[PDB]
Structure 1
């Protein structure tokens, strides 16, 4: 039993809700919140911008030190950093950004990072400003992630479309 509430069950291990991931994280304080990161951990907009703003820019300060030490992530890769006031940990995962021409096949590799964590609160990778089809992202999620994932979808119209079209 866990504290996640109001989710629709899609499969044995994948759940979905129309929710603001920032507000959901603030309320649940999950062990892991996933950020829709880029390779530079520049949290300017989208989910990353929102999560970072909610940490009063502490996420960005920590991220800048991480990059200065380690260099950029790979597309499809991840790193574990602090969850600040939102979660114990933040798993920064880089899905491919279609608006930069990155290979969508890397979306499966990106979701594989979730399997290193038993339970996660997460957005749909490569959705939103990353330019991928969120229906495709949900399909890859369900077919790749084996651990327990609670998906927060900000847009109510999109949430209803994702549910109604789910196979």
Structure 2
């Protein structure tokens, strides 16, 4: 099970970890991907998770998009976790660098409530352009299920823990 996490609340845990390495070690039921509406896993967490699957995530995702069309910002879909997890919950947080409504971050985190336990990154953080401190706040105030947050950057992890109210 999950090890080395700092407990933030009754249901939110955090660790300075590479989510790919964490997923490969734990093989959780659900790993969350920081997806975009097209499931084009080019960079950030999505690029890293997809590369770890040897592009199998992208091949599955392209078939999903060909059948269903794009996701909504704030939406999600469940696909295979490949070699990383039983399932991957692809969640689309708003991309601030594309002018998307930051208010959709709460809707994005609501997708986590459909799963009892998840390994996840901070939505809309990193290359999605939102303030990770704000993302953690929305996470703790929205997610009620057990979420294990992996924060890649040590310096950001320390800032998140030390500023956590």
Q: Establish whether TM, by shorter chain, passes 0.5.
A: yes
Q: Residue deviations 1:32-62, cap 9 Å, x none?
A: 0000000000000000000000000000000
Q: Tell me the TM-score normalized by structure 1.
A: 0.99
Distance between the aligned counterparts of 2:45 and 2:2, measured in 1? Answer: 19
Shift of residue 96, structure 1, vs aligned partner: 0.1
SS at match of 1:64: helix
Q: Residue deviations 1:5-48, cap 9 Å, x none?
A: 00000000000000000000000000000000000000000000
- For residue 66 of structure 1, the aligned residue among 64, 67, 91 is 64
Distance between the aligned counterparts of 1:9 and 1:27, measured in 2? Answer: 20
SS at match of 1:38: coil
Distance between the aligned counterparts of 1:27 and 1:129, measured in 2? Answer: 25
Shift of residue 132, structure 1, vs aligned partner: 0.1
Distance between the aligned counterparts of 2:55 and 2:71, measured in 1? Answer: 20
Distance between the aligned counterparts of 1:138 and 1:87, measured in 2? Answer: 23
Distance between the aligned counterparts of 2:141 and 2:85, measured in 1? Answer: 26
Shift of residue 104, structure 1, vs aligned partner: 0.3
Distance between the aligned counterparts of 1:63 and 1:15, measured in 2? Answer: 29
Give the length in aligned residue pairs: 165
Shift of residue 138, structure 1, vs aligned partner: 0.1
Could you say what the CA RMSD is over the residues aligned between the two structures, in angstroms? 0.1
Instruction: Identify unmatched segments of 5+ residues in structure 2.
Output: none
- For residue 15 of structure 2, the aligned residue among 17, 22, 26 is 17
Distance between the aligned counterparts of 1:89 and 1:56, measured in 2? Answer: 16
Q: What pairs up with 1:33-48 in 2 under 5 angstroms? A: 33-48=31-46
Runs of 4+ in 1 over 6 A off after TM superposition: none
Instruction: Identify unmatched segments of 5+ residues in structure 1.
Output: none
